[PDB]
């Protein structure tokens, strides 16, 4: 998995069926890292630290073994809670 | 899931059986990075901002889970 | 599969329920590289070499073909065989 | 998907029953890449660009869910 | 897949049970290159160029659908540079 920020939510889009209401998120590792996309299965805001799963265990964790998604937010980071 | 662009369709009239008529298009993150082949499941044109996933989600994205995609489109983005 | 070092424990208390109890840890191929996480199906502490797997494989090594992992440890390295 | 070229024919007489009498090939991206090896369910020469898939779809690409593949030759790309 | 060199065997004494007692071998693209770790399928020494498969066909590649690799040994490489 990996440890990723909260850029902003993608709205400016027109995307395809198989993908429900769940919404889609811009992640990176850092600023200025390349900017990738994340199914939010948890309830994010911009600047959240976010645990992000790839591969097929993104499917089921944005709500589906059908679902299309190959990058899905499963946690919020606790930066300071030890 | 990637944002990328669409350069050019990509032709290919050898392939397997598998891949039926779904159009394929060359698309990279932005110019003069390393080229890609997605499957476009949406209806794109080159210059398109798409939105493109890849892993087993691809497939099913493609139209069906048996389907040889590593890389779909699906959706297009405007404000890139 | 990667070799990796176990920094810290890796909090997140606001995670999907699927994810059960497992423990997250933070690893690394060594210390300054990019920082990775992995559901600990050993029980390893900091400063342990481990192996860890990714892919499909993870998610079955984390407890279930449905578990939401794509990076699990399967081992902890005996470094000096 | 990938585009790549295919280099030559990858010779390994001491392998998994699991991979029965499919071609393997050397690819890479480019010459001077880093080389890589696709099964190919085509029917390619040296010399040919070719689309590869990876991931699962490579598996059921090669002829069947079980097959041991992650990246597999799925067309012959026209502009050679 | 990859085309890669055995460099040595892997311990790992404190590894998860679906692991079996398959062998797990240090495996990179070259010398100084990044290691990466393979469950053997053939039967490899140090120095065998091996041909090594990744993704979902790295499971049943070491012997069932259920086994926890991403990275598996699935030939020999006959005579490499
Ligand atoms: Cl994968």
Redesign the interface.
Known sequence: ???MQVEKT?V?????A??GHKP?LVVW?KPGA?????VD??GCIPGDWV?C?????????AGSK???????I?????QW??
């Open positions: 998995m990996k440890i993608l400016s889009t027109n995307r395809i198989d993908m889609l590792e390349p900017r990738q996309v994340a299965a948890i645990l799963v790839g591969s097929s265990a993104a499917r089921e964790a059908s679902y299309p998604s190959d990058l899905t499963i946690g919020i980071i606790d809670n030890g």
